[PDB]
DNA sequence: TAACTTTGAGGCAGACC
DNA sequence: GGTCTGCCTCAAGACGG
């Protein structure tokens, strides 16, 4: 189904990408209480309720084709091959629970839902993002990345790339300059989160620190410079800098994505296999989604 | 067969020039 | 004065076909 009244948008359709593993993950995690153990019906309606609230923002702006991009580390991620402390990062909640009960849920949508779910096990969903912004945003599209993860901030250098932040409210806004410095700020002076370390330190900083550790200031002079003009990359910094610094490339500026990856990204979603705008309604039913039958034409 | 345990922002301390 | 880093807390779900 689709008669209709979509008021004059655009050929090259809105897009929005949707880092799924936040706002499902992150709205459980504000939403459900201490060791009870999370069943699957309490995941379910949670997911599809922040798909639908999600998707009424997404689809009353602009951006129609919706894509939910999904962590998928069963083999291990690529970066963490490059990169064994990547993430790594070094319990009363039912972790377990939400997990076991999400994996269900996501084939399901795979199953029975209008939208490309790009799930590659061994790709990020940064990887996903990345590089469907990275085409789409050339190929003349407009963007809508939803997701509060600040990372992202390096993909608002391509045009027509906005972001929203599902948990907060706001508009993710480019954060102090321009993008190109936003990037080379994670790819210098690292980034935690990710624990990704500084170009001033070992590798495995943050996985291997003893107490008292403490970075060299990294003065923002550098960052500029170097962010304005990369060729200073081999000036500005130490031998061992450097090659600190070609490894955060890869680990944090999405342009260092291999190429391969990047086709095998684009192929997986040019031939994705989308089902009929018809099995939602008998999946609701299928599993228990009665309240929600009476509003779907809202996905 | 496998693994995935959020995000930034706003304070505040201490080290450096 | 100012800049840099690290640590600690905080608070984030829109059901007319």
Known sequence: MDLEMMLDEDYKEGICLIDFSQIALSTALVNFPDKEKINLSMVRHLILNSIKFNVKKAKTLGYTKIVLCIDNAKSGYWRRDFAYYYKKNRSTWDWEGYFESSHKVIDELKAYMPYIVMDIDKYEANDHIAVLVKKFSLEGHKILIISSDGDFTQLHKYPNVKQWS???????????????????????????????????????????????????????????????????????????????????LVLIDFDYIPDNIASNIVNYYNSYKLPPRGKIYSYFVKAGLSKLTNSINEF
């Open 166 to 248: 599902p948990m907060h409210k706001k508009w993710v806004k480019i954060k102090s300059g321009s993008a190109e410095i936003d990037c080379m700020t994670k790819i210098l002076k690292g980034d935690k989160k990710d624990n990704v370390a500084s170009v001033k330190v070992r590798s495995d900083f943050w996985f291997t620190r003893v107490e008292g550790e403490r970075t060299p200031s990294m003065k923002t002079s550098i960052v500029e410079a170097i962010a304005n003009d990369r060729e200073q990359a081999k000036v500005l910094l130490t031998e061992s800098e450097y090659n600190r610094y070609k490894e955060n």
